[PDB]
């Protein structure tokens, strides 16, 4: 769980559903309450139907409200379920989230918040990739760690070897291309990423490692 690396630890900011700091505490309390109310509204908005006997129940996680200085971004994960020539109901829902010209949801929310609002829906293809969605749906280890540790040791040793080779052949060592010789986006990122695999479950606590 390397804290110095953004692929190897969850940012502590992400363990709050409302991610905000306002110098004006009144406004911060108001924004927290707004986020809770909008989450309840969005939950109400995830059930659709194409006439009777055609009910469709999208399952969304809790919203993640990212408040920045000039914008709010409401990110949420969701789970759903010849097609090129019409729009199914879930597509219509998401398109009213952002893409409609006249009365899209983010403009109305922008008035509610008095700051720009965007909505970021993220589809999850399985239901056991998110404990919240898995719970809302069922309402209606050593070897992997060893491989991960081996990869981390290999990357560290690779950088060390690179740097000593530069020193052989102040603190500024040399050009970046040689300090990071075999250290590319095509091998390092996915090998250092954490929480790739579900290693345990208890039906709703999902353990990802």
């Amino acid at each position: 769980g390397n804290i110095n690396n953004k692929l190897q630890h969850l940012n502590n900011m992400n363990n709050w559903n409302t991610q905000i700091y306002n110098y004006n505490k009144n406004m911060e309390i108001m924004n927290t309450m707004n986020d809770k109310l909008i989450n309840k509204l969005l939950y109400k908005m995830m059930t659709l139907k194409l006439n009777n006997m055609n009910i469709n129940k999208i399952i969304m996680s809790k919203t993640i409200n990212q408040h920045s200085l000039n914008k709010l971004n409401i990110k949420f994960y969701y789970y759903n379920n010849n097609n090129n020539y019409y729009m199914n109901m879930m597509n219509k829902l998401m398109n009213i989230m952002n893409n409609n010209m006249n009365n899209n949801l983010c403009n109305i929310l922008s008035y509610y918040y008095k700051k720009k609002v965007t909505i970021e829906p993220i589809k999850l293809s399985y239901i056991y990739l998110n404990s919240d969605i898995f719970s809302k749906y069922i309402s209606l280890d050593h070897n992997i760690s060893m491989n991960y540790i081996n990869n981390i040791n290999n990357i560290n040793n690779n950088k060390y070897n690179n740097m000593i080779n530069l020193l052989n052949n102040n603190n500024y060592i040399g050009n970046i291309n040689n300090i990071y010789n075999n250290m590319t986006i095509d091998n390092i990122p996915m090998d250092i990423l954490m929480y790739k695999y579900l290693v345990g479950w208890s039906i709703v606590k999902l353990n990802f490692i």
């Binding site: 900011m13 200085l69 000039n70």
Partner: protein, 144 residues
């Protein structure tokens, strides 16, 4: 083999800081967050932006973390306000406005910002407006 120019190399190193020439403080930027990660990342980004804009910026001075505490009757909860200070020196108002606009445009989730601007310069009522109305009303004017 592949040329990596200086701008890309600078991303892989600590941000550069321009020297302070007169020591005229022109603004201080206080950043606050309930976590320290986004706060420090954003502070580094502000330093980079300021360097390229030509602004001497000292650095994200650590300021005392405020602790708030709540007891639930005996479960303890607390909230930590982390605070960084970036001061700007020897810069024109317009460049500094550009800095503030740019870093506002590209701000991070959960970070608030207060900006004090110091501008050196040459030397050279609702109740009251209602009290008059009440006193010029027949109910009060009759006793006077």
């Amino acid at each position: 083999t592949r040329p990596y120019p200086v701008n890309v190399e600078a991303v892989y190193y600590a941000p550069l800081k321009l020297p302070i020439k007169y020591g005229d403080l022109v603004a201080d930027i206080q950043l606050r967050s309930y976590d320290n990660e986004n706060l420090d990342f954003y502070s580094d980004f502000i330093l980079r932006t300021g360097y390229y804009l030509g602004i001497p910026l000292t650095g994200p001075k650590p300021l005392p973390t405020r602790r708030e505490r709540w007891t639930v009757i005996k479960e303890n909860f607390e909230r930590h306000t982390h605070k960084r200070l970036i001061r700007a020196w020897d810069t024109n108002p317009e460049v500094l406005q550009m800095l503030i606009a740019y870093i506002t445009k590209h701000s991070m989730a959960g970070v608030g910002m207060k900006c004090n601007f110091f501008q050196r310069s040459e030397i050279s009522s609702a109740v009251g407006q209602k009290v008059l109305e009440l006193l010029d009303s027949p109910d009060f004017k009759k006793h006077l």
